[model samples]
Target: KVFGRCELAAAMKRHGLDNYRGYSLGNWVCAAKFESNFNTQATNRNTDGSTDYGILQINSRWWCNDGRTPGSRNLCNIPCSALLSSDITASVNCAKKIVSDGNGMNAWVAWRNRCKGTDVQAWIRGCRL
Candidate 1:
């Protein structure tokens, strides 16, 4: 189940990023597809028992982006409760901040820079609209 679909929708609306400038739901879904394949339980192991988890593949302790610890803060895979409690802002606010902070689709930029060199346009099929 989605942890905070309502919050995400609200956050998206609040940030003026939902299809306002042509970023449809399909666009968002495609981004998630390339990022975590829509897998909420996705996780990457670490040297310690902690793990980076969630759909966005967020590391709990990456930085102070969400007011979380900067070290060893993984709550494991599928712990939506922890993610809910965290500053994920249902991930919408987080993503909005990222795209805004990075200056226009920065998440896509980083994803392209890190993962497959696929273009964002190619990632989103209008049929999903």
Candidate 2:
């Protein structure tokens, strides 16, 4: 599913992520930008035989059940497919839970490599939310 930056910011706001789980809206938006480029249907198969799902790339190894991957922790207790929806409610909630566990945005390699310490104001440049 294609998504604009401002549009995603609105959804993030609606999911109460403007400031939740010890992260700023900029961190969330920047993470999503590098994670999936705002695509809801994004998925990546890891060399470790795990998979990443949705915008934040929640991993099947820890956060969601993809069915193909056995012994998944499924910490978010949601189907991996749910995270691939345009709705993004499940994705946001699961991301919050992951961050609440004290990982913060460090759970996402994209955040660490691409977003951390960057100027992310352009991500929400014109959003009214």
Candidate 3:
């Protein structure tokens, strides 16, 4: 998401990010800062070497390989490997699951409310579908 910020913005500034209305880059930036600290190039490998990759920290061993494609090599290096097949809603749901909240942007909204200003954290929290 953050990866598409400047690059996509520069490509088609008109409607490039209009579809991403509620998913603000500012919120994403805040989320990453609070959750994973904006490291799109980060990764985590288990003792068995399975990897959790990218800034969103999508695990390559989980649903990362189940996109419109098959198999991902070096999930950390190639952003497309995860994002191309990334289910946007599923990704948000998984994040909510981990945070144990109904709101999809728990981490992000929380960061914004406390760090930025009063916000619609409850709205995003209730955004399931």
Best-fitting candidate, scored by lDDT:
2
**Of 1 and 3, the candidate ranking higher by lDDT:** 1
How does residue 46 of candidate 2 score in lDDT? 96
Residue 102 in model 1: shift from native, Å?
Answer: 3.8
The global C-alpha lDDT for each of the candidates, from Candidate 1 onward, is: 0.46, 0.87, 0.41
Where in model 3 is the C-alpha error above 4 Å? Answer: 1-21, 45-50, 66-103, 107-129
lDDT of 3: 0.41
Candidate 3, residues 11-100: lDDT per residue as tens digits? Answer: 222322222434543444445444444445555564544555445555554335533233544322434345333233334434434344
Kindly indicate the candidate among 1 and 3 with the higher TM-score.
1
Count of backbone collisions within predicted model 1 = 0
Q: How high a TM-score does candidate 3 get?
A: 0.36
- Best candidate, TM-score-wise? 2
The predictions' CA RMSDs to the true structure, in order, are 7.0, 1.1, 9.9
Model 2 worst lDDT window (10 residues): 18-27
* Per-residue accuracy of model 2 over 1-129 as CA lDDT, tens digit each: 868888889889888998786567888999998999999999999988999988989999988888888776889998899999988899999988988887677888999999888887767888897
Clashes of 3: 2
> Cα deviation in Å at residue 23, candidate 3?
3.2
lDDT: worst 10-residue window of model 1: 72-81
